[PDB]
Design a protein around this nucleic acid. Structure first.
Ligand code: ZN
Lengths: 86, 812, 48, 49
RNA sequence: UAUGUGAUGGAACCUCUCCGGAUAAUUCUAUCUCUUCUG
């Protein structure tokens, strides 16, 4: 018999799958070519070994490293949208 | 009765036909569709058609009357019923009230739109809203009554009580009820929950419930119970006002309690006209329920303000505590009262904690012979307060004899709770299948939940004397009070006979042990020796925090090193407490990192403080050894490896069962070797069982009726895998050796963590090669294998624990 | 549940505790990853 | 379908049972550590698919 | 739409309880229909 429960939200739609981001490295971090190369190698290995993020299964692809609003934090409540033609 | 007179009895919702004798069809329908029909055969009857005055087309008044009748019956005769009857009645009343409230809310919702076009028509709509508020108040009452008797399964407060209290508070606040809101707040406060915010402050609820309240001629305050909760509300309000520290006034601090007492005291009763005092034969001074339940409040107010004596309230308070069980809320109220007094600093805590501890021991001693105390919500607090009071009154004493007697009292207080483990509610509820007396006690405790004034309860070898030895006795103890965490270790010197006290911190030791346990459990079975570095760090921390043990070597050198005869009694006894049962106390390393405690002092442990004055008799059978060994088909390597023992005189019994152990117990040999695996249980320490051909468990061995006699038992079952993993420093469990010592055995040698075969077989060979009198010499001769340079030796040879008895130690 | 039956344990995981539970049941599920699955050949509404 | 079910529960009583809610209550607990967990030295070395 | 020397939330089975059941011969005779004109 059940003892406890809670609430979850799930997204299984095909469109909302791919997520993209970036990592910013300052000039001090890029001290020289050797340090940047070692950092890139370690980052690639770590990105390869990542398996699970945010309650799901995913794999990370890392590209080449080359480059150069308000949330309404006041009082508000809105829910129970139901559906059209109700 | 002036009622429906259809229900057979309030506590059993049945109707013995006869419902059709009435004329109202709605009453018949309600009594038929929502109650058990009783009888054993189907009933087929009906009324007569063509009845006038309509049918009134609704059921709400009838359901409201049923709900009110059920609540009134529960209020009046709720004590005599059992738990199931209370639950059933409360559930049915809640269901009926919920249906009525839903119907009324729906009707109001539909009527609101229609009355919107009526130009703000103030009409019977207001009466419907008032009826909805009344139904909400009744639902809050029912929810509070149901929540007050929820069975506390587990160590923590069950969630069901929390949700019930929240629902009751919501209903009471929406219904604009003050007394019920105050009661709900009082119940929430005692549960230690703090979900309320500053907006929902307990102080504002108490003030609202107590603002403009007088006895007068109000019907709600006619009964004595409501007066009792009014007094409790006023007491809590005064307590919180004093605790806020914003009312620190020299005169008002006594004025508030003076007016509280004046309300409690006789309010100038006028109109008796001095009715001749007509000699009512001294009718035993029958105490009413009011004083029966307000004895605690009277004692509290007398302590707060009474410049004189207050023993009159103490007299009946003591008997009320003795008669009622531990599940009564009055016990928790008294413990919290003692804690508040101790924080404030009035000696009443000092003179009351010992008395309450004695009463608690006397009440707990009346349990079954299995020696269990059950889990009381606030029990460690009372013991800690008693220990602290004993220590404080020892410190302030100016006489050496008084100091020694108070230290002995503190040692006895610490000893009192060191063997009986609490086993929660559900665990012993499941365990109580075999014993009917345990079931009766469980039923009594369940019935005692909620309220007071129960007619069932009303109608009803020296420990610290003298320890005769030349060794040293260490009695560890840990205090788990929330704001006053500390540690203690009482040391008894045999030469001087004087007791000593000190303090130490155990949090770093706890952290080191937690790290070692994690790294040991995460390792594979065949690679458990990798925790040597963590074990060394734990030992070093233990030595750093217990350096005071090494101090006695200076006194020993001053005593006998100057004397011609050296090598005096250097035995040491340890009495571990709480989580200190699973750490190598004898493996402590000096601060400089060059000295080990085991090198100088011969250390042995004991489950409790020995007081038996009988020496176990010599073994009836002089059999050398009684090896018992079982293993699964996988681990044949151990069976193959153990051959040196079978060369020695043994009638080998492989694949033996528990009955083999019982038969060996029937005829005790000189030495017994119980070597097998083990498994642990988290629900019951009594379910810890050994991996023999059958399962041994602890409950089977607890009652055997056959006692050993001077049998040296070697246990091959490690403690770590025989016990569940430890989380949080609070521990209350029993060990196999602790129960074995109750069977008259001589000494028990065990392993704290897995000892791989080479070491255990070498130890077995060495101990069997030992003679009778000098057996302990070769038992202790393992010190040469322990060194600080090699951590592997420390891991291998520090896992051995010896449970040597006091009455046989130091005897030559 | 099946692995607990096999190993004969009574673990409940007690929701959030002071320290991780350890023990084999919580030591083996800490290193097991399971993918979600969908019906490969059926998409019709079910029966009542 | 759901709409007609609602109309039935609304207009047609006594056509269905409801002591349905028992032994549930939702619970969500969280607690931060009080002591340093420490460090370990055993790590993964194999993977199975 | 983060803030950085610290995230076992893959860290939790919507579980448990309930005969689509009960009652009924695939049988069989009395009319149907309203305005007629002095008879
Ligand atoms: Zn676990």
């Amino acid at each position: 018999k059940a003892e406890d429960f809670f609430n979850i939200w799930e997204i299984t739609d095909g469109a909302w799958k791919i997520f993209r981001g970036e990592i910013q490295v300052s000039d001090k971090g890029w001290s020289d070519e050797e340090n940047f190369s070692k950092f890139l190698t370690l980052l690639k290995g770590a990105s390869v070994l990542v398996d699970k993020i945010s309650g799901g299964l995913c794999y990370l692809t890392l590209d080449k490293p080359e480059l150069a609003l308000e949330p309404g934090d006041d009082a508000s409540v809105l829910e129970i949208s139901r559906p059209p033609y109700w | 009765s002036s009622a429906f007179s259809g229900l057979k009895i309030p506590e059993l919702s049945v109707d013995p036909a006869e419902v059709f004798k009435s004329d109202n069809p709605q009453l018949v329908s309600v009594l038929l569709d929502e109650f058990e029909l009783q009888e054993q055969r189907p009933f087929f009857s009906g009324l007569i058609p063509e009845k006038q005055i309509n049918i009134a087309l609704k059921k709400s008044p009838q359901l409201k009357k049923l709900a009110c009748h059920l609540l009134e019956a529960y209020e009046i005769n709720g004590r005599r019923w059992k738990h199931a009857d209370r639950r059933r009645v409360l559930e049915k009343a809640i269901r009926l009230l919920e249906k009525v409230s839903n119907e009324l809310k729906g009707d109001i919702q539909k009527l609101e739109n229609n009355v919107k076009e009526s130009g703000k028509d103030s009409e019977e709509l207001n009466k419907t809203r008032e009826k909805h508020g009344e139904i909400l108040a009744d639902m809050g009452r029912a929810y509070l009554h149901r929540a007050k008797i929820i069975r506390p399964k587990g160590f923590t407060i069950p969630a069901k009580k929390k949700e019930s209290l929240r629902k009751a508070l919501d209903f009471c606040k929406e219904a604009k009820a003050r007394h019920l809101a105050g009661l709900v707040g009082l119940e929430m406060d005692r549960c230690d929950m703090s979900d309320f915010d500053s907006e929902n402050s307990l102080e504002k609820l108490l003030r609202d419930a107590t603002t403009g309240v007088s006895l007068s001629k109000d019907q709600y305050y006619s009964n004595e119970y409501r007066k009792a909760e009014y007094y409790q509300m006023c007491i809590r309000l005064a307590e919180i006002e004093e605790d806020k520290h914003g009312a620190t006034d020299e005169g008002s601090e006594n004025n508030r309690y003076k007016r509280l007492e004046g309300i409690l005291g006789p309010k100038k009763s006028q109109g008796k006209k001095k009715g001749k005092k007509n000699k009512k034969k001294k009718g035993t001074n029958s105490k009413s329920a009011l004083e029966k339940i307000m004895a605690f409040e009277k004692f509290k107010v007398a302590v707060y303000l009474g410049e004189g004596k207050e023993k009159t309230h103490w007299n009946d308070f003591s008997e009320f505590l003795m008669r009622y069980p531990f599940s009564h809320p009055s016990w928790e109220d008294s413990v919290r009262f003692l804690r508040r007094l101790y924080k404030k600093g009035n000696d009443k805590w000092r003179e009351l904690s010992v008395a309450l501890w004695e009463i608690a021991k006397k009440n707990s001693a009346k349990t079954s012979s299995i020696h269990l105390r059950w889990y009381w919500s606030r029990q460690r607090d009372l013991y800690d307060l008693a220990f602290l009071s004993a220590l404080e009154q020892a410190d302030i004493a100016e006489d050496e004899s008084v100091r020694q007697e108070k230290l002995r009292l503190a040692a006895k207080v610490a000893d009192s709770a060191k063997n009986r483990p609490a086993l929660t509610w559900q665990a012993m509820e499941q365990m109580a299948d075999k014993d009917e007396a345990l079931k009766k006690e469980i039923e009594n405790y369940a019935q005692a939940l909620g309220g007071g004034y129960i007619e069932q309860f009303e109608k009803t070898d020296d420990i610290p004397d003298d320890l005769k030895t030349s060794g040293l006795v260490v009695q560890f103890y840990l205090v788990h009070l929330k704001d006053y965490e500390n540690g203690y270790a009482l040391i008894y010197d045999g030469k001087t006979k004087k007791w000593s006290c000190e303090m130490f911190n155990f949090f770093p030791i706890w952290e080191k042990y937690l790290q070692w346990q994690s790294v040991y459990f995460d390792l594979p079975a065949n690679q458990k020796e990798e925790s040597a570095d963590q074990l060394k760090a734990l030992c070093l921390e233990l030595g750093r925090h217990l350096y005071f043990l090494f101090d006695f070597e200076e006194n020993r050198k001053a005593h006998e090193k100057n004397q011609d005869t050296a090598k005096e009694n250097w035995d040491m006894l340890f009495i571990p407490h709480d989580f200190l049962h699973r750490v190598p106390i004898h493996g402590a390393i000096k601060k400089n990192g060059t000295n080990i405690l085991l090198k100088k002092f011969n250390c042995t442990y004991f489950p409790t403080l020995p007081n038996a004055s009988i020496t176990p008799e010599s073994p009836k059978s002089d059999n050398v050894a009684e090896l018992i060994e079982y293993f699964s088909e996988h681990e044949k390597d151990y069976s193959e490896y153990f051959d040196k023992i079978e060369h020695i005189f043994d009638k080998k019994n492989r694949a033996a069962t528990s009955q083999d152990l019982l038969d060996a117990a029937i005829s005790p040999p000189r030495t017994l070797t119980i070597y097998c695996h083990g498994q642990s249980d988290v629900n019951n320490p009594f379910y810890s069982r050994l991996l023999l051909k059958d399962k041994l468990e602890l409950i089977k061995l607890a009652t055997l009726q056959e006692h050993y006699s001077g049998t040296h038992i070697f246990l091959g079952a490690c403690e770590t895998d025989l016990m569940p993993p430890l989380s949080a420093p609070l521990d209350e469990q029993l060990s196999m050796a602790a129960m074995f010592l109750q069977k008259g055995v001589g000494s028990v040698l065990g392993t704290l963590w897995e000892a791989y075969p080479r070491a255990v077989k070498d130890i077995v060979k060495n101990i069997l090669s030992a003679d009778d009198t000098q057996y302990f010499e070769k038992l202790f001769s393992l010190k040469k294998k322990i060194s600080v340079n090699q951590k592997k030796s420390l891991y291998y040879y520090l896992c051995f624990k010896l449970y040597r008895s006091f009455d046989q130690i130091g005897k030559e | 549940r099946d692995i607990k039956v096999v190993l004969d344990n009574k673990c409940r995981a007690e929701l959030a505790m002071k320290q991780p539970c350890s023990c084999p049941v919580c030591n083996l599920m800490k290193k097991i990853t399971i993918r979600d699955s969908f019906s490969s050949n059926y998409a019709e509404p079910p029966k009542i | 379908g759901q709409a007609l079910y609602l109309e039935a529960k609304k207009q047609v009583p006594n056509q269905f049972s409801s002591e349905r809610p028992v032994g549930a209550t939702p619970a969500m607990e969280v607690k931060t550590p009080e002591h340093d967990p420490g460090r370990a030295a055993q790590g993964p070395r194999y993977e199975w698919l």
